[PDB]
C-alpha cells in the first residue's frame, strides 16, 4: 500500500523532536529537512516531529528517539505512517506538567531550569498528549503536554507561553516510563546486541506467526562475560523494547530460601511467565543455582538443578517465552544446562573497546553538566581494562567529587540544595582525572579482543610482504567468490621468523588493521602461566573466542619462549593442543592464525606442516631504505628539527634492528628532554636572580649514535640468512 507507511528503527539524533529518513525517501514522500512531519502510530495516537536526512537510515525505515517511539505506543519493527504537516501554527499557551515519580526527589523551579533551555531557540513541534524528556541537574524528568492553545499540535516559538501548575500527575497505565532501561542505555557492544535482537525479535514480537509456522526458535539464550559488562542490563532492555513480560530470577535470592521454597519459587516464576506470554524469564547469576556437577555436593542443591532442568524442558509449552540467563563464569555452569533444547545459544558480551567505553561514558554523563575541558574520548583511551560498571561508577564518583567541592561553599547553608544549584553544578576534567586515580578496574587481566591501531604506516619497509599478507588474509575475506572461481581454498596460517626487533609483532597487528578484523595476541610466556591442568581448557577457549570475533586474526607471539621449555612436559601438552585446535579450525570460519619466533632453529616441525603454519615468511633486518622509513615512523609523533639528516643516519646504522633504531630515537630524545629539564631550572635560576627550546637537534642524534649498540651480532645474522633458505626442510631430520 501507501508509501507513507514506514518501519520503526533505532535513533541517531538523540534529540526528542527529531525523526530521520533517507534522502531518497525524503524525496519520495517529498519532504525536506525543515519540514514538520505528522506521525500516526498504533493504539490510535499521534506525534509531530521535525524531519531530517540521514545517510545511514535505510529508505524503508524511520529513525525515531525512544521518546517519540513511546508517544506512538510503538516499538522497533512496527509500522507507522508519516505525512507532511505545514498546517502547524505557533502556540499561544502550552500547559505542561511533570510526572510525580520523576521529580519527587528534586525540588525547585521546574519551569525555569528544564523547560526554559529545552524550548528556547528549539521551535519544537509538540502534540497534545505527548510526553517529552528533559535531562538536567543530574536528573531526567518527563513532562506531559496537557494542553496547547492551537490543539492538538503546535510549534513552540519564543512568543509561546509555558506554564506548570505545581503538583505533578501520575503515570497512566499505558505510559511506559522513559526512566526504564533501553537499547540507548547500552553501548560499545553492538554486534552482540544484534545477535540477541535477532534471536528474540521473531518469536517475541510476532508470537502468532511463530506458533503457526511450526519451526523451532531459540528458547534458552545464555549471556556470559566478566562481571559488570551489562548482562543484566541487556536482558531488561530486550524485554522492554519488545514489550515482553519480564520475570526476574535472582540466583542468590532463590538459593537463600529453604529447600522446598527454592524449587517452588522456580515453578511459580515459569508459571507466571507462561501466563503472561510473550515473556522473558531472566536468570541472573545462574552459576548460583546450577554450578558444575561435582561442586554441587549437598543433595538439596542438586534437586534445584534438576528442577530447573525440568522447567527448561517444561518449555514444551512454548508459550511464547524465552529464558535468558547471565553468568560471570560460563565454565561454572552445569553442562546439563548448555545442552540442546535448554541454553543452546551463547553470547559473549566481552569487555568494551576504546570506542565502546566512550559510548558508555556518554550514557552516564547524559544528565550531568560537564565542563568544556572534559574530553571523554581522552578518558576513554586512558580507562583501559575498564568494564561498563567501572565506567558507570567512575562517572558517578567524578560527579560526587564535583559535588563535594561545590558543597564546601553551599555548606554555609546546607539545608537548601536546589535543582537550580544542581544545574549550575559543573563537572571539570579534573573531577574525572580524580576519579581515574580512585578507580579499581576489574578487567585488566582479561584477554582483550579488538581491532589494533597499528597501521601499515607504522611499519617501515617489507612492502611486498605487506602485500603477500593482503593476499593471504584480506583477499579471501573481501573476495570469497573469487577464490571459489579459481577452485582454491587459502592457507590457514603464516609463520614470521627472523632476528629480534624487525617488526614481526607489528605486522601481525598491521594486517589486522587493514582487514578491519579483530585481533588476538597470545605470547609464549602467557601459555606457560596456565597451571598444568588448566592449560587444556584455556587453549580451547582461545580458539572459541576467535570464532566469536570472526573475521579474526589469532597471533601467537614469542614462540621462542615455548620452544625453549620443551627440549618439560607442561609446554609440550600446550602446543600439541594448539596443533589440534588448528586442525579443528575450519578454514571457512574466517579465522587466521599467525606465528612469530626469534628462534627458527627449535620451532616444532609439526607446526610447519601443510594446513597449519605453512606460509613461511622471513623478516630480516632493515636495509638502507627501510631504516629511513622506520626512523620517520617513530618520530612522526616527535618534534624533529629540519637539521636532522636521516639518510646519512641510515647508512651509519647498517646492522641495526628495527628495535635498535627506536632505541636511538628514544636515547636521543631522552637527551633532548634532559636538556629541556635542565634548561627550565636555568630559566628558574635567572628569574630568582616563554621562549623554551623544545626541539631535537643534530648533536642529540650524534650523541645517541655515539652510545648506540647492536642487538643482532654478525654471526647471528649469517645463520638467520641460512635459515631463510632451509626452514622448510625441518620436517625431515634436523638441518
Ligand X SMILES: Nc1ncnc2c1ncn2[C@@H]1O[C@H](COP(=O)(O)OP(=O)(O)OP(O)(O)=S)[C@@H](O)[C@H]1O
CB nearer ligand X, residue 82 or residue 269: 269
CA atoms of 726 and 735, how far apart (whole Å): 8
Q: Which residues bind Mg ion (CB under 5 A)?
A: 232, 505
Under the criterion CB under 6 A, does residue 192 sit at the interface with ligand X? no
Are 357 and 380 in contact, with CB atoms under 8 Å apart? yes
Residue from the set 399, 508, 527, 591 that interacts with its own copies by CB under 8 A: 399
Tell which residue, 602, 515, 610, 609, has the closest CA to residue 564. Answer: 602
Q: Is 230 annotated as a binding residue?
A: yes
Q: Is 524 annotated as a binding residue?
A: no
Under the criterion CB under 6 A, does residue 506 sit at the interface with ligand X? yes
The H-or-E segment that residue 540 falls in is helix 535-548
Q: Is 564 annotated as a binding residue?
A: no
Q: Is 358 annotated as a binding residue?
A: no
Q: Hey, what's the cell of 421? A: 544549584
Q: Are strands 93-98 and 139-148 parallel, antiparallel or unpaired?
A: antiparallel
CB nearer Mg ion, residue 81 or residue 442: 442
Q: Hey, what's the cell of 191? A: 554486534
Q: Is 505 annotated as a binding residue?
A: yes
Residues 473-502, one symbol each (x = binds ligand X by CB under 6 A, - = not), give ---------------------------xxx
Window 431 to 450, contacts with its own copies (CB under 8 A)? 438
Q: Which does 264 bind (CB under 5 to 8 A by kind): Mg ion, its own copies, ligand X, none?
A: none
The H-or-E segment that residue 6 falls in is strand 5-9
Residues 98-137, one symbol each (x = binds its own copies by CB under 8 A, - = not), give -------xxx------------------------------
Query: Which region among 9-17, 370-378, 406-414, 630-638 touches its own copies (by CB under 8 A)?
Result: 406-414
Q: Is 308 annotated as a binding residue?
A: no
Non-local CB neighbours of 151 within 8 Å, separated by 6+ positions: 128
Under the criterion CB under 6 A, does residue 427 sit at the interface with ligand X? no
Q: How many CB atoms neighbour CB 460 within 10 A?
A: 22
Are 156 and 120 in contact, with CB atoms under 8 Å apart? no
CB nearer ligand X, residue 502 or residue 575: 502
Under the criterion CB under 6 A, does residue 662 sit at the interface with ligand X? yes
Residue whose C-alpha cell is 543484566? 232
Under the criterion CB under 8 A, does residue 413 sit at the interface with its own copies? yes
Q: Can you tell me whether residue 518 is helix, strand or coil?
A: strand
CB nearer its own copies, residue 222 or residue 269: 222
Under the criterion CB under 8 A, does residue 678 sit at the interface with its own copies? no
Q: Hey, what's the cell of 669? A: 630524545
E-only strand ranges, 65-112? 79-84, 93-98
Q: Which does 730 bind (CB under 5 to 8 A by kind): ligand X, Mg ion, its own copies, none?
A: none
Q: Is 440 annotated as a binding residue?
A: no
Q: Is 328 annotated as a binding residue?
A: yes
Q: Is 232 annotated as a binding residue?
A: yes
Under the criterion CB under 6 A, does residue 231 sit at the interface with ligand X? yes
CB nearer its own copies, residue 267 or residue 406: 406
Q: Is 231 annotated as a binding residue?
A: yes
Are 712 and 657 in contact, with CB atoms under 8 Å apart? yes
E-only strand ranges, 242-380? 245-250, 279-284, 321-327, 343-348
Q: Phi and psi (nearest 5°) for 289?
A: -85, -45
* Angle (CA) 687 689 695, round 5°: 40
Under the criterion CB under 8 A, does residue 422 sit at the interface with its own copies? yes
Q: Report, in Å, the least distance between residue 115 CB and its own copies.
A: 19
CA atoms of 367 and 419, how far apart (whole Å): 12
Tell which residue, 553, 533, 557, has the closest CA to residue 543. Answer: 553
Q: Is 501 annotated as a binding residue?
A: yes
- Intra-chain end-to-end CA distance of the chain, in Å: 76
Q: Are strands 343-348 and 220-224 parallel, antiparallel or unpaired?
A: parallel
Distances in Å between the Cα of 111 and the Cα atoms of 17, 143, 150, 675 are 19, 10, 21, 59
CA atoms of 113 and 421, how far apart (whole Å): 10
Instruction: Give 447's Cβ-side CA count (13 Å radius).
Output: 21
Query: Which region among 25-33, 408-416, 538-546, 608-616 touches its own copies (by CB under 8 A)?
Result: 408-416
Are 556 and 597 in contact, with CB atoms under 8 Å apart? no
Under the criterion CB under 6 A, does residue 392 sit at the interface with ligand X? yes
Q: Is 40 annotated as a binding residue?
A: no
Under the criterion CB under 8 A, does residue 227 sit at the interface with its own copies? no
Under the criterion CB under 8 A, does residue 77 sit at the interface with its own copies? yes
Residues 157-196, one symbol each (x = binds its own copies by CB under 8 A, - = not), give --------------------------------------x-
Q: How many residues does the chain have?
A: 735
CA atoms of 567 and 276, how far apart (whole Å): 64
Q: Which does 506 bind (CB under 5 to 8 A by kind): its own copies, Mg ion, ligand X, none?
A: ligand X
Residue whose C-alpha cell is 499561544? 92
β-pair partners for 450 = 519
Residue from the set 75, 124, 127, 139 that interacts with its own copies by CB under 8 A: 139
Q: Report, in Å, the least distance between residue 457 CB and ligand X.
A: 10
Q: Report, in Å, the least distance between residue 231 CB and Mg ion.
A: 6
Are 147 and 93 in contact, with CB atoms under 8 Å apart? yes
Window 288 to 347, contacts with ligand X (CB under 6 A)? 326, 328
CA atoms of 391 and 358, how far apart (whole Å): 9
Q: Is 364 annotated as a binding residue?
A: yes
Q: Which does 202 bind (CB under 5 to 8 A by kind): Mg ion, its own copies, ligand X, none?
A: its own copies
Are 70 and 129 in contact, with CB atoms under 8 Å apart? no
Q: Are strands 161-163 and 46-53 parallel, antiparallel or unpaired?
A: unpaired
Are 6 and 68 in contact, with CB atoms under 8 Å apart? no
Q: Report, in Å, the least distance between residue 107 CB and ligand X.
A: 25
Residues 607-646, one symbol each (x = binds ligand X by CB under 6 A, - = not), give -----------------------x--xx------------
CA atoms of 271 and 279, how far apart (whole Å): 11
Residue from the set 503, 551, 600, 620 that interacts with ligand X by CB under 6 A: 503
Q: Is 116 annotated as a binding residue?
A: no
Residue ranges in contact with ligand X by CB under 6 A: 185-189, 227-233, 284-285, 326, 328, 360, 363, 388-389, 392, 459-460, 500-506, 596, 598, 630, 633-634, 658-659, 662
Q: What residues form the annotated binding site for ATP?
A: 227-233, 328, 364, 501-506
Q: What residues form the annotated binding site?
A: 227-233, 328, 364, 501-506
Residue ranges in contact with its own copies by CB under 8 A: 1, 5, 7, 60, 77-79, 105-107, 138-139, 195, 198, 201-202, 206, 208-209, 211-217, 367, 393, 396, 399-400, 403-404, 407-408, 411-414, 417, 419, 422, 438
Amino acid at each position: 500500500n501507501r508509501p507513507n507507511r514506514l518501519i520503526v528503527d533505532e535513533a541517531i539524533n538523540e534529540d526528542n523532536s527529531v525523526v530521520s529518513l533517507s534522502q531518497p525517501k525524503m524525496d519520495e514522500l517529498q519532504l525536506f529537512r525543515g519540514d514538520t512531519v505528522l506521525l500516526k502510530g498504533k493504539k490510535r495516537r499521534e506525534a509531530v516531529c521535525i524531519v531530517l536526512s540521514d545517510d545511514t537510515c535505510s529508505d524503508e525505515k524511520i529513525r525515531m528517539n525512544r521518546v517519540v517511539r513511546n508517544n506512538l505506543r510503538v516499538r522497533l519493527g512496527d509500522v507507522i505512517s508519516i505525512q507532511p504537516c505545514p498546517d502547524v501554527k505557533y502556540g499561544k499557551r502550552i500547559h505542561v506538567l511533570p510526572i510525580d515519580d520523576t521529580v519527587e526527589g528534586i525540588t525547585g523551579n521546574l519551569f525555569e531550569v528544564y523547560l526554559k533551555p529545552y524550548f528556547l531557540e528549539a521551535y519544537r513541534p509538540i502534540r497534545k498528549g505527548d510526553i517529552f524528556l528533559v535531562r538536567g541537574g543530574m536528573r531526567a524528568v518527563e513532562f506531559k503536554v496537557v494542553e496547547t492553545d492551537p490543539s492538538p499540535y503546535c510549534i513552540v516559538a519564543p512568543d509561546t507561553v509555558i506554564h506548570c501548575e505545581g503538583e505533578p500527575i501520575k503515570r497512566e497505565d499505558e505510559e511506559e516510563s522513559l526512566n526504564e532501561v533501553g537499547y540507548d542505555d547500552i553501548g560499545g557492544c553492538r554486534k552482540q546486541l544484534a545477535q540477541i535482537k535477532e534471536m528474540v525479535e521473531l518469536p517475541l514480537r510476532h508470537p502468532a506467526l511463530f506458533k503457526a509456522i511450526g519451526v523451532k526458535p531459540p528458547r534458552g539464550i545464555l549471556l556470559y562475560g566478566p562481571p559488570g559488562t551489562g548482562k543484566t542490563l541487556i536482558a531488561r532492555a530486550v524485554a522492554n523494547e519488545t514489550g515482553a513480560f519480564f520475570f526476574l530470577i535472582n540466583g542468590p535470592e532463590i538459593m537463600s530460601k529453604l529447600a522446598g521454597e527454592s524449587e517452588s519459587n522456580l515453578r511459580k516464576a515459569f508459571e507466571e511467565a507462561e501466563k503472561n506470554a510473550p515473556a522473558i524469564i531472566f536468570i541472573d547469576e545462574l552459576d548460583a543455582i546450577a554450578p558444575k556437577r561435582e561442586k554441587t555436593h549437598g543433595e538439596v542443591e542438586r534437586r534445584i538443578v534438576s528442577q530447573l532442568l525440568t522447567l527448561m524442558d517444561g518449555l514444551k509449552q512454548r508459550a511464547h517465552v524465552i529464558v535468558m540467563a547471565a553468568t560471570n563464569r560460563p565454565n561454572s555452569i552445569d553442562p546439563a544446562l548448555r545442552r540442546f533444547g535448554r541454553f543452546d545459544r551463547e553470547v559473549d558480551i566481552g569487555i568494551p573497546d576504546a570506542t565502546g567505553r566512550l559510548e558508555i561514558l556518554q550514557i552516564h554523563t547524559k544528565n550531568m553538566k560537564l565542563a568544556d575541558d572534559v574530553d571523554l574520548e581522552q578518558v576513554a583511551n586512558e580507562t583501559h581494562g575498564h568494564v561498563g560498571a567501572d565506567l558507570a561508577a567512575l562517572c558517578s564518583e567524578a560527579a560526587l567529587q564535583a559535588i563535594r567541592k561545590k558543597m564546601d561553599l553551599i555548606d554555609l547553608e546546607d539545608e537548601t540544595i536546589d535543582a537550580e544549584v544542581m544545574n549550575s553544578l559543573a563537572v571539570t576534567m579534573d573531577d574525572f582525572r580524580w576519579a581515574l586515580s580512585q578507580s579499581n578496574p576489574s578487567a585488566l587481566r582479561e584477554t582483550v579482543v579488538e581491532v589494533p591501531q597499528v597501521t601499515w604506516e607504522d611499519i617501515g619497509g617489507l612492502e611486498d610482504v605487506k602485500r603477500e599478507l593482503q593476499e593471504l588474509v584480506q583477499y579471501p575475506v573481501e573476495h570469497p567468490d573469487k577464490f571459489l572461481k579459481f577452485g582454491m581454498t587459502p592457507s590457514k596460517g603464516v609463520l614470521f621468523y627472523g632476528p629480534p626487533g624487525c617488526g614481526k609483532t607489528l605486522l601481525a597487528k598491521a594486517i589486522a588493521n587493514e582487514c578491519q578484523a579483530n585481533f588476538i595476541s597470545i605470547k609464549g610466556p602467557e601459555l606457560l602461566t596456565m597451571w598444568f591442568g588448566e592449560s587444556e581448557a584455556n587453549v580451547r577457549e582461545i580458539f572459541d573466542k576467535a570464532r566469536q570475533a570472526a573475521p579474526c586474526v589469532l597471533f601467537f607471539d614469542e614462540l621462542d619462549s615455548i620452544a625453549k621449555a620443551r627440549g618439560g612436559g607442561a609446554a609440550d601438552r600446550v602446543i600439541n593442543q594448539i596443533l589440534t585446535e588448528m586442525d579443528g579450525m575450519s578454514t571457512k570460519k574466517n579465522v587466521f592464525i599467525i606465528g612469530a619466533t626469534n628462534r627458527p632453529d627449535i620451532i616444532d616441525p609439526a607446526i610447519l606442516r601443510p594446513g597449519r603454519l605453512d606460509q613461511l615468511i622471513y623478516i630480516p633486518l632493515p636495509d638502507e631504505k627501510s631504516r629511513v622509513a622506520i626512523l620517520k615512523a617513530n618520530l612522526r609523533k616527535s618534534p624533529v628539527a629540519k637539521d636532522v639528516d636521516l639518510e646519512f643516519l641510515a647508512k651509519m646504522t647498517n646492522g641495526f634492528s628495527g628495535a635498535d633504531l627506536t632505541e636511538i630515537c628514544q636515547r636521543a630524545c631522552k637527551l633532548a628532554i634532559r636538556e629541556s629539564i635542565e634548561s627550565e631550572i636555568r630559566r628558574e635560576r635567572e628569574r630568582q636572580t616563554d621562549d623554551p627550546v623544545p626541539e631535537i637537534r643534530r648533536d642529540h642524534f650524534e650523541e645517541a649514535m655515539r652510545f648506540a649498540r647492536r642487538s643482532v651480532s654478525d654471526d647471528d645474522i649469517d645463520k638467520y640468512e641460512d635459515f631463510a633458505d632451509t626452514l622448510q626442510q625441518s620436517r625431515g631430520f634436523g638441518s
